[PDB]
Design an enzyme around this catalytic site. Structure first.
Site, short mmCIF file in Angstrom:
data_model
loop_
_atom_site.label_atom_id
_atom_site.label_comp_id
_atom_site.label_asym_id
_atom_site.label_seq_id
_atom_site.Cartn_x
_atom_site.Cartn_y
_atom_site.Cartn_z
CE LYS A 37 -0.72 -1.14 4.86
NZ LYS A 37 -1.30 -0.63 6.13
CG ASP A 91 4.08 2.42 7.27
OD1 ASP A 91 5.28 2.16 7.53
OD2 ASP A 91 3.73 3.14 6.32
CD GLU A 147 -6.13 -14.09 0.47
OE1 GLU A 147 -6.68 -15.21 0.51
OE2 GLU A 147 -6.25 -13.24 1.37
CG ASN A 173 -0.75 -4.48 -5.37
OD1 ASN A 173 -0.87 -3.96 -4.27
ND2 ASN A 173 -0.82 -3.78 -6.49
N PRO A 184 0.21 -5.47 -11.69
CG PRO A 184 1.73 -5.49 -13.45
CD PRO A 184 0.61 -4.68 -12.86
#
Ligand SMILES: [Zn+2]
Lengths: 103, 144, 313, 292, 144, 101
Positions: C27, C51, C220, C247, C288
């Site tokens: 991200k 973060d 996923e 991604n 990608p």
């Protein structure tokens, strides 16, 4: 929680006969002394909790840290409940003279 | 005997006042019949909810995620609907609570000015303290 | 719909472009790329970060602090980062656990009675947006942490204003007894200077036309379901959104022997397929996997190209 | 250190093997694989599903139901599946957030006068476990769904008698209930095998799972991984080796943490999974480390 | 009026009964002073908790996940540890309260037999209720 | 509430009962107690005091009526407590009267 409150209340309901019997000229004074016993009731233990905080925000807007923050609440509570005791004394007088009414 | 029967009539009065203060749940029960109408409708909603919940439970996430999410959204939508109705119910309950509290306090004022008309200072503050303090403190005993 | 992100570029009304989505996703990387593209949009832009890993650094090979800063090779690009913000977002933990309507300000004032931390968190969060607005940037890009949410914060002090605001009228009845009894500054000054801009930014966020969220996921299931939860919670907090990013997705066909890659990207294609149907109303992206260990502004520029134009090997 | 399920494979006293761990995992596949290897282990085994996808059928190409049945091309293998797993834990799901103090019997005694609310679900589960005993198989293996637990539930009714213990169909059901609960608490007769993929979300999820298990007093030693890419020293398409760097970072991170437990590398097979052969080569893999 | 004097002294000892009932702090002071030590040790445990919490607030789940889960296990461990410990201390206090309350029940029956031997029949048949009533109603007014 | 409520009527009936009366006075008093019990008829806007015995009760049988029967049994025992004992507190009072007055 109402231990001392109702205790002295019923002691007043008792002392009605002695006082309107006029032991002496200490009539409303012994009432003060009954209340005076109130703090020696705190002498062994009177643990409890202070209730929630809403207007204490306004207090914070006024400042005046914890000392009076608590003094105000305690004194309000105590003054209210002793006003209670006081004209409960007076109620007991009303009944001492209910006696004379039926008499 | 009426002389002091009046000093006890003040009691009778405040007795009525406080028992009515506890009676207010009667008009609240009228409001509860209102709540029962809207509760019928929300119960229809709840039945729909249980239905779609089971439907959901019949579906595989790892291979039919589409239906699952579409459902979940519909479910939370019905849930927001029921929550809105709950909010409306407690809001109108607050409304009735406030208006009936004002009714009680204004009848307090009414009885005040009434007893004043009937006596027309020290006796008056006595009146007030007896009624308020003694009856509210026995009310505290029965309803802290 | 449109599988590229350039709609974000076209809408110059935007000022805050959040980026979120948990899991092992770059991200930070993709956000940096969006930033560089916004710079390519010739505006006055600035990224933030929350973060603790400061991945922005490794994407930029520069050290930073709590203060805005240039970045070499760029002029309008600006970086900055605040872990102290996630730190001060811990102070309202108790309000986070309730998220009510009334008792929020009530617990705020009770804790203010305890140790005066309400205005603490308040001014803490304030300074950030204060300086931010002060520099007067075109847009602002956030990199939220992978644990929690700081947008929602602003629905807290507005609830809290219900105290202060209503408190304000008691100010009248506060005047006499004080003047009949005989640092009052902090509360009045700091709150009357923060809650204005706090109201401003809070209103700003709700606007569907200048605040926009970019979730990012991976192809996923578990991450998909996670970002779905995110979408729902976001709509709950009534924030705009149009665009998610995936991604690590090549799906090539030059060579056979990538049988492992074959089945892997088959699975990932299945899952993004499950995604698309559900997200017709969102600008899907297919970003990608860079066929190399991700480092340096080169890959950032690569992401930039891929974000402008729809990728096809 | 310990790299394979042998501890599960080389043990008789085990009777209950669970799996679990949410996500797009072939947990059914590795479940059936372990099952097959227990079959080779010369026992009496019984696989039980809870996932409404019934992928045991997928791997085995037959239809089944609440009846325990044989398995084609095999001898001792026995299957079964129950979506009522969902029902016996659905209202008990909110009960898991309604029974966490000394009031565990309150929700079951409040509406008990009306209809005994929270008991009949446990009774359906009791019938379940009855049949589970049924023809007593040496090892029943589970396959949990992606949510909840049919395990701690069994430890709920052993509380309801407490008050009654201070003096209809309980005096015969609750005994075997307590029996199998004690079985579950034992670290020697039952165990869990959570299963994760090399993605940080699934990793953290399984972490929470293991903490929750050790909380609820179960044991575990084994974490199968899955969808593992493996690039040969031959020409690697850089996508393979990049995904490999990622999976290596995650796996490494996992290593130092779950050292006390075994680990089961298990690469994604480079083909499609519909038939026994997949489960068979998995079964093979569940004894020796994978070698490409 | 010596008989009435003796009977009212009896009623004063009846007062003594709810004096016994209210003796609870005179005993529980011992247990409070006893527990205070582990109580402050527990507060220090809470300290350690917050310590390692903010420490966690300095680490990276995305990369340093190992140490993260390690600390997390430690956290939950100490957390449930202190929770169990304080619950156990409360259970101990409740134990003390119960057993001392029953010991003062025994004090009550001791005063009962005391009054019996004191007055030492229809006299008993009456006086038993004559004293039971006042004792138990004072106990009632103690806690509504 | 009605504990001290009917206590008030007892305070009233003190002079009534110590006053010249025929065959039996307390009966009269005891009847007013029932009237106070009728006060429970409207005044039921309450809830049950939490118990631990309903479990053993539903283990026993027929809960649909017996729990209410037992709750009203304990209410009647409380009525015994209240009425009988405030009455005899009043009785102790008028005994003090006839002794010292
Ligand atoms: Zn390949």
């Amino acid at each position: 929680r109402i231990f001392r409150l109702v205790g002295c209340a019923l002691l007043a309901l008792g002392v009605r006969a002695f006082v309107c019997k006029y032991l002496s000229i200490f009539a409303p004074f012994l009432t003060l002394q009954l209340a005076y016993m109130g703090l020696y009731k705190y002498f062994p233990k009177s643990e409890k909790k202070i209730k929630t905080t809403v207007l204490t925000a306004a207090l914070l807007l006024s400042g005046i840290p914890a000392e009076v923050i608590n003094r105000s609440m305690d004194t309000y509570s105590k003054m209210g409940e002793v006003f209670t005791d006081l004209c409960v004394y007076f109620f007991t007088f009303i009944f001492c003279h209910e006696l004379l009414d039926y008499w | 005997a009426a002389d002091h029967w009046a000093w006890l009539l003040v009691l009778s009065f405040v007795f009525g006042c406080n028992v009515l203060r506890i009676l207010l749940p009667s008009f609240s029960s009228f409001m509860s019949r209102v709540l029962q109408k809207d509760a019928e409708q929300e119960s229809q909603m709840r039945a729909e909810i249980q239905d779609m919940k089971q439907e959901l439970s019949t579906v595989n996430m790892m291979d039919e995620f589409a239906r699952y999410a579409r459902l979940e959204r519909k479910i939370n939508k019905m849930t927001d609907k029921l929550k809105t109705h709950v909010k409306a119910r407690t809001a109108q309950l607050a409304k009735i609570k406030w208006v009936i509290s004002v009714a009680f306090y204004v009848l307090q004022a009414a009885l005040m000015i009434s007893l004043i008309w009937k006596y027309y200072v020290a006796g008056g503050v006595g009146i007030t303290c007896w009624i308020l303090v003694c009856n509210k403190v026995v009310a505290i005993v029965l309803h802290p | 719909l449109e599988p590229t992100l350039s709609n974000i570029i076209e809408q110059r009304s935007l000022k805050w472009i959040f980026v979120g989505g948990k899991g092992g996703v770059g991200k930070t990387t993709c956000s940096c790329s969006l930033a560089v593209q916004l710079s390519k949009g010739r505006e006055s832009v600035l990224i933030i970060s929350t973060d603790p890993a400061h991945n922005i650094s490794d994407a930029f090979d520069q050290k930073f602090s709590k203060v805005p800063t240039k970045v070499k090779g760029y002029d309008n690009l600006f970086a900055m980062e605040i872990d102290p913000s996630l730190g001060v977002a811990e102070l309202p933990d108790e309000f986070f656990e309730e998220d009510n309507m009334l008792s929020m300000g009530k617990k705020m004032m009770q804790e203010a009675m305890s140790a005066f931390p309400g205005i603490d968190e308040a001014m803490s969060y304030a300074e950030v947006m204060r300086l931010v607005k002060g520099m007067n940037f075109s847009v602002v890009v956030f990199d939220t942490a992978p644990t929690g949410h700081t947008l929602r914060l602003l629905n807290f002090p507005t609830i809290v204003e219900r105290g202060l605001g209503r408190l304000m009228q008691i100010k009248n009845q506060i005047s006499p007894f004080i003047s009949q009894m005989c640092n009052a500054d902090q509360l009045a000054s700091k709150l009357e200077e923060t809650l204005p801009v706090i109201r401003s930014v809070s209103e700003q966020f709700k606007d569907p036309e200048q605040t926009t969220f970019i979730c990012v996921c991976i192809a996923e299931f578990l991450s998909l379901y996670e970002t779905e939860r995110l979408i729902q919670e976001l709509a709950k907090c009534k924030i705009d959104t149009h665009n998610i990013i995936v991604n690590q997705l090549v799906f090539p066909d030059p060579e056979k022997p990538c049988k492992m890659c074959e089945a892997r990207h088959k699975i990932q294609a299945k899952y993004l397929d499950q995604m698309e149907d559900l997200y017709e109303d969102f600008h899907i992206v297919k970003l990608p996997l860079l066929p190399h260990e991700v480092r340096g502004a080169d890959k950032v520029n690569t992401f930039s190209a891929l974000l402008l134009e729809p990728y096809k090997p």
